[PDB]
Amino acid sequence: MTRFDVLTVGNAIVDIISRCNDQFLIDNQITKAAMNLIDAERAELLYSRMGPALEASGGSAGNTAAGVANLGGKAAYFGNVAADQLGDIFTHDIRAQGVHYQTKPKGAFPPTARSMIFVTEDGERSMNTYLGACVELGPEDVEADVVADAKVTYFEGYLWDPPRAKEAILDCARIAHQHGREMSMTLSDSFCVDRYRGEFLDLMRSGKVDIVFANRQEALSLYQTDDFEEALNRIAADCKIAAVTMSENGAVILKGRERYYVNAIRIREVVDTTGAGDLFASGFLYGYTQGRSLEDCGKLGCLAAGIVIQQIGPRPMTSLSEAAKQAGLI
Amino acid sequence: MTRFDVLTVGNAIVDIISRCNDQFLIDNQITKAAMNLIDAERAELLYSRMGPALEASGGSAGNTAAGVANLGGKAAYFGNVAADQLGDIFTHDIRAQGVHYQTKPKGAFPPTARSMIFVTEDGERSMNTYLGACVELGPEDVEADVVADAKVTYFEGYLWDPPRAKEAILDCARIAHQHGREMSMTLSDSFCVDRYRGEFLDLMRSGKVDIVFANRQEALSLYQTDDFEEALNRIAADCKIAAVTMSENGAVILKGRERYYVNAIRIREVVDTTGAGDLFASGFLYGYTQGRSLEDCGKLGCLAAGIVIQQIGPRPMTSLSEAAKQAGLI
Ligand SMILES: Nc1ncnc2c1ncn2[C@@H]1O[C@H](CO)[C@@H](O)[C@H]1O
Numbered sequence: 001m002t003r004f005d006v007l008t009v010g011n012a013i014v015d016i017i018s019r020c021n022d023q024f025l026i027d028n029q030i031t032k033a034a035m036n037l038i039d040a041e042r043a044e045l046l047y048s049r050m051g052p053a054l055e056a057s058g059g060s061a062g063n064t065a066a067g068v069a070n071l072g073g074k075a076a077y078f079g080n081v082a083a084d085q086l087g088d089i090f091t092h093d094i095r096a097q098g099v100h101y102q103t104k105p106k107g108a109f110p111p112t113a114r115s116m117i118f119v120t121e122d123g124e125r126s127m128n129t130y131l132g133a134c135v136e137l138g139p140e141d142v143e144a145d146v147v148a149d150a151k152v153t154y155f156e157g158y159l160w161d162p163p164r165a166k167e168a169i170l171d172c173a174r175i176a177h178q179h180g181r182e183m184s185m186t187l188s189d190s191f192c193v194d195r196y197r198g199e200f201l202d203l204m205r206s207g208k209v210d211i212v213f214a215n216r217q218e219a220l221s222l223y224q225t226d227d228f229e230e231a232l233n234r235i236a237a238d239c240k241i242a243a244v245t246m247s248e249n250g251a252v253i254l255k256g257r258e259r260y261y262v263n264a265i266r267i268r269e270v271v272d273t274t275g276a277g278d279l280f281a282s283g284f285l286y287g288y289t290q291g292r293s294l295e296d297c298g299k300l301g302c303l304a305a306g307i308v309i310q311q312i313g314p315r316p317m318t319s320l321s322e323a324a325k326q327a328g329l330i
Numbered sequence: 331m332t333r334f335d336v337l338t339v340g341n342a343i344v345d346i347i348s349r350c351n352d353q354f355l356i357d358n359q360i361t362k363a364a365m366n367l368i369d370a371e372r373a374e375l376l377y378s379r380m381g382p383a384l385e386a387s388g389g390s391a392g393n394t395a396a397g398v399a400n401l402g403g404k405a406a407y408f409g410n411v412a413a414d415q416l417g418d419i420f421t422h423d424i425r426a427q428g429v430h431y432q433t434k435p436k437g438a439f440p441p442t443a444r445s446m447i448f449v450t451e452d453g454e455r456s457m458n459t460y461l462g463a464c465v466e467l468g469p470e471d472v473e474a475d476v477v478a479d480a481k482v483t484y485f486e487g488y489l490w491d492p493p494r495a496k497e498a499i500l501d502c503a504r505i506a507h508q509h510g511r512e513m514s515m516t517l518s519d520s521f522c523v524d525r526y527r528g529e530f531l532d533l534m535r536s537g538k539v540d541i542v543f544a545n546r547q548e549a550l551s552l553y554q555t556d557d558f559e560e561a562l563n564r565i566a567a568d569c570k571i572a573a574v575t576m577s578e579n580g581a582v583i584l585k586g587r588e589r590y591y592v593n594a595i596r597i598r599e600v601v602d603t604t605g606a607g608d609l610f611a612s613g614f615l616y617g618y619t620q621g622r623s624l625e626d627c628g629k630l631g632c633l634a635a636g637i638v639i640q641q642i643g644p645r646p647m648t649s650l651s652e653a654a655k656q657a658g659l660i
């Protein structure tokens with residue numbers, strides 16, 4: 001018996017969420033459905049144009065860790081906040097979900113990362129992220145005991161933007177594999193993949209990553225192709241297990257020559273897609289660390305994702321474990 | 331043509347919102363449905379026991395001003411935040427709604443007020459408020475030109491808790507009545523009324539307040555009676571106009587011997603009662619300053635209240651003006 005099912009590592013972010021029209025994205029040159037990196041000046045600018053907002057703890061890997069705990073798994077998280085009110089919110093929210101979170105802030109400046117997330121009428125989300133204190137995440141923040149005692153260590157593609165986070169990730173990979181654990185990543189965003197395409201391929205091909213998460217857009221970007229079938233064939237060749245999501249078209253889990261397709265749950269209405277991919281990973285990884293079939297992992301992932309997209313905010317406010325029990329996924 | 335329809339004055343607060351069971355309230359000695367003042371030590375203690383939360387700009391009068399702007403009226407707000415991240419959120423949200431808000435922070439400590447609001451399964455909300463920078467609001471924060479140029483100046487009973495806010499209110503009353511405007515207050519909370527019963531009665535009887543807002547519990551507390559008919563008779567004798575809310579039983583507007591009963595709107599589900607009274611005031615006062623009948627003012631209030639209780643958070647995220655037009659209140 002270990003200490004953790006899943007350790008996640010990512011950019012520790014508080015979300016600032018508002019509804020907007022499609023014209024707002026165009027007028028502000030915000031790339032729809034993407035993670036748009038912004039500096040401090042642009043952050044003030046966009047905020048000044050944003051309507052009344054709601055704040056909620058975010059960060060892709062943070063959301064995933066929270067989702068694992070919610071389901072009943074044992075989660076830990078590495079991510080750097082500042083010693084400020086946003087950092088205190090982030091710290092409270094993830095710990096309150098029962099995620100082990102011990103990353104120490106290094107002062108108040110730069111301040112805690114925030115992402116201004118604009119949700120259009122179709123429920124799509126477009127994020128505008130000032131990384132702030134995230135740029136300080138480094139090897140010093142790896143709790144080696146936690147990596148050793150975690151069945152899976154999962155991290156964001158997004159970690160390739162700050163300068164030193166990749167160094168922590170390579171340390172994690174070493175420790176995890178020396179202790180017989182597995183490493184997992186998400187490709188995070190199609191433009192993120194475009195920035196670090198060769199780096200991500202090498203992580204998979206070198207065996208530093210055992211399990212990869214992608215959506216259709218990320219898979220297409222990875223191989224710079226318009227052929228989804230090609231992308232699936234190539235991603236299966238590059239990593240031991242790939243979990244590929246296709247929004248309303250469900251998901252497909254790849255392992256060698258095996259493909260396992262899973263239906264998407266039918267939705268009342270899509271309120272806010274923020275966190276869908278993150279909570280797919282929560283469901284998948286919770287299932288995987290419980291020894292479940294790859295199809296059942298995919299099912300648990302789709303259930304979590306379906307729930308999160310029917311609420312405002314990236315972390316389900318309801319019990320995922322109760323939802324899983326009702327679904328016979330238990 | 332004057333600059334503002336409604337000026338409101340209150341405690342400038344950011345809400346920290348979480349769902350709990352009724353046992354949580356009992357275990358923590360939290361008075362259900364009430365505003366519970368807390369010190370910094372208790373605030374840290376309650377937060378440590380609170381689940382994952384979402385944050386949203388609050389403050390009773392702040393919500394009311396936001397509501398008036400949403401409906402399409404011209405609003406201003408007086409309230410003191412700190413120069414910190416929470417005060418920046420508060421400043422942004424209220425201004426983003428189109429409310430004039432120019433109260434200057436005086437420093438970073440005490441920090442911006444926050445209220446931990448626990449929503450039980452029945453949708454009732456129980457608030458736990460550390461006043462922080464609110465204690466600094468005083469005469470120096472009265473923008474005399476704004477008072478002079480506002481049709482109605484409305485304020486919270488809650489302002490009697492901090493030490494100097496009442497002095498600002500007395501100055502407001504003087505400037506308002508010198509310029510032929512009207513003053514309004516809400517009784518805020520039944521325990522607030524119990525703390526300041528004689529002071530509140532004197533505000534009404536002296537004519538410093540022209541229009542009073544109360545719910546049933548507040549009206550009963552004011553006269554220390556179990557007889558609601560007595561409370562209505564007495565409140566009508568003590569102020570020019572009283573607007574008394576009765577939750578699912580609608581509202582009654584009183585003027586001398588005139589009484590106007592208004593029905594509650596039909597609702598899907600009570601998600602979170604936070605802000606109901608605030609937004610009743612928004613609807614009523616928007617109507618009042620547009621020269622609408624007292625019955626139509628009550629209708630506009632019940633519409634606004636009904637909308638806010640079907641969402642999480644105290645400020646409607648949808649267009650109240652659109653809703654009013656759809657309801658045939660225009
Ligand atoms: N650069 C980034 N790194 C990690 N997560 C991010 C980034 N930008 C936005 N997010 C998070 O993505 C989550 C949705 O997947 C949001 O909660 C938001 O907090």
Ligand SMILES: Nc1ncnc2c1ncn2[C@@H]1O[C@H](CO)[C@@H](O)[C@H]1O
Binds near residue numbers: 365390393488605608
């Ligand atoms: N002491 C207080 N004074 C003014 N407003 C308050 C107080 N405590 C809580 N509130 C606000 O009451 C609003 C709901 O009516 C909430 O948004 C909360 O912010």
Ligand SMILES: c1ccc2c(c1)[nH]c1cnccc12
Binds near residue numbers: 190221224226
């Ligand atoms: C960002 C997002 C997607 C893409 C990209 C950059 N470059 C590509 C080249 N080919 C296909 C997709 C992409």
Ligand SMILES: c1ccc2c(c1)[nH]c1cnccc12
Binds near residue numbers: 556
């Ligand atoms: C708080 C809330 C309600 C009340 C109170 C204090 N004192 C009362 C005396 N009589 C009736 C109600 C009350």
Ligand SMILES: [K+]
Binds near residue numbers: 275308309310311313
């Ligand atoms: K969501």
Ligand SMILES: [K+]
Binds near residue numbers: 642
């Ligand atoms: K509400």
